[model samples]
Target: ASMVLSPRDERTLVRKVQINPRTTAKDLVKMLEETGTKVSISTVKRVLYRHNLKGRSARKLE
Candidate 1:
């Protein structure tokens, strides 16, 4: 029944990423929040779902 993030708190959207760098969630959201405000967008959906169902169903980190 529960879910992730706000529906209309505010937003932007895009598609990109860094290198092999293993960044935590904290590093993602904040940048995304402001990074787009200044210009366009950052990452969002991919990381969330990949980790969400992963925790609920099968957590197999590769």
Candidate 2:
């Protein structure tokens, strides 16, 4: 069986990504949990993939 996320959840994920393009699936999971939406990192990644997005860690020259 597969998990089913609500449209609102999908929008929330997209909004978070738009706010921070570099946000990782792990961070997304944490955010979701904070909002009481608990989900796995893989699931977040799957959502990101459908949105034509890929998460990445921060990158800045020291």
Candidate 3:
């Protein structure tokens, strides 16, 4: 089974992970899991990549 990120979860994930770009999708998934947030690496990868948060094409907003 798979799940799509809720807008609230998306915001939370971005806020946390975006604080560390060197953190890979796997890292974000681990962090969230540690907090008892049910998410997967593939989902994180999809969300971040979809929102352009993973590469040179990504934008920086403070």
Best candidate, lDDT: 2
Ranked by lDDT, top first = 2, 3, 1
- Model 1 residue runs over 4 Å out of place are 1-18, 37-62
What C-alpha lDDT values do all the predictions have? 0.39, 0.63, 0.60
**Would you list the clashing residue pairs of candidate 3?**
none
- Candidate 2, residues 13-42: lDDT per residue as tens digits? 666675676877777777777778656677
Better of 1 and 3 by lDDT: 3
| TM-scores for every candidate against the unseen true structure | 0.28, 0.51, 0.48
Model 2 is weakest, by summed lDDT over 10 consecutive residues, at 53-62
How well does model 2 score by local distance difference test?
Answer: 0.63
- Which candidate comes out best when scored by TM-score? 2
Task: Give the higher-lDDT candidate: 1 or 2.
Answer: 2
Candidate 1 lDDT over 1-62, as tens digits, reads 03424333222111122322355456556765655533222335455555444433222463
Score candidate 1 by lDDT: 0.39
Error of 2 at 9 (Å): 3.1
